[PDB]
A paper describes a structure:
Except for an N-terminal region, [name] is highly conserved from yeast to human and contains a C-terminal domain of unknown function (DUF1115; PFAM ID PF06544). Here, we showed that [name] orthologs contain a C-terminal U4/U6 di-snRNA binding region that encompasses a DUF1115 domain and a preceding peptide rich in basic residues. Our crystal structure and targeted mutational analyses demonstrate that the DUF1115 domain acts as a ssRNA-binding domain that specifically recognizes the first 10 nts of the U6 3′-overhang. Our results indicate how [name] functionally bridges U4/U6 and U5 in the tri-[name] by [name]-RNA interactions on one side and [name]-protein interactions on the other.
We therefore determined the crystal structure of yPrp3CTF at 2.7 Å resolution. The protein crystallized with three monomers per asymmetric unit. The electron density allowed modeling of residues 335–467, corresponding to the predicted DUF1115 domain. The structure exhibits a five-stranded mixed β-sheet with two α-helices (α1 and α2) running parallel to the β-strands on one side of the sheet and one (α3) on the other. The first 98 residues of the structure (residues 335–432) form a α/β sandwich with a ferredoxin-like topology and an additional, long β-hairpin (residues 403–421, comprising strands β3a and β3b) inserted between helix α2 and strand β4. The ferredoxin-like fold is further expanded by an extra β-strand (β5), a helix (α3) and a following loop at the C-terminus. In two of the three independent molecules, the β3a/β3b hairpins adopt very similar conformations with their long axes oriented perpendicular to the direction of the strands in the central β-sheet. Residues D405 and D418 at the bases of the hairpins coordinate an Yt3+ ion. To test whether the C-terminal U4/U6 di-snRNA-binding region is conserved in yPrp3, we produced a protein comprising the 177 C-terminal residues of yPrp3 (residue 296–469; yPrp3CTF). yPrp3CTF bound a yU4/U6 duplex containing the complete stem II and a 13-nt yU6 3′-overhang (yU4/U6stem II+13nt) with an apparent dissociation constant (Kd,app) of 0.92 µM as determined by EMSA (first gel and quantification) and with a Kd of 110 nM as determined by isothermal titration calorimetry (ITC).
Author numbering: 335 to 467
The structure:
């Protein structure tokens, strides 16, 4: 049979609340794929693979329900940080079908450089799904 697939690209995900939601929902839905980002503060990619119903549900989650631009606060050993996200965004970039699915669950990974990200995507035959800048 045939696997439905979607891919999204974000400018930032330092927000722990966003991270939680993406996790929990991937968990509850039986979707497969990954979320990769260049360092804690960099851009990245979400890839999702499953049946049509689940993919559209996730599309809704990510493009409609999540406030990618919502301000949040971080706490450290030297003090507090207020993060304003007015210029963060999410973008849905690819949409289609696969005969083959190389992902084995749904996982996240923070990479050190863009090449580390591209190398990873390539282990799953997916270098092309990303758009560098
Ligand atoms: Y249909
Ligand atoms: Y703001």
């Amino acid at each position: 049979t045939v696997y439905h697939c979607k891919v999204f690209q974000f400018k930032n995900l330092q927000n722990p609340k966003i991270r939680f939601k993406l996790k929990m929902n991937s968990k509850e839905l039986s979707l497969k794929g990954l979320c990769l980002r260049i360092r804690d503060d960099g851009p990245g990619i979400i890839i999702v693979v499953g049946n049509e119903k689940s993919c559209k549900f996730y599309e809704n989650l990510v493009m409609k329900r999540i406030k990618w631009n919502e301000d949040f606060e971080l706490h450290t050993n030297t003090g507090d940080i207020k993060m304003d996200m007015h210029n963060n965004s999410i973008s849905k970039t690819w949409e289609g079908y696969l005969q083959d699915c190389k992902f084995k669950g749904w996982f996240m990974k923070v990479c050190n450089d863009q090449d580390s990200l591209l190398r990873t995507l390539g282990q799953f035959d997916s270098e092309h799904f990303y758009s560098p800048v």
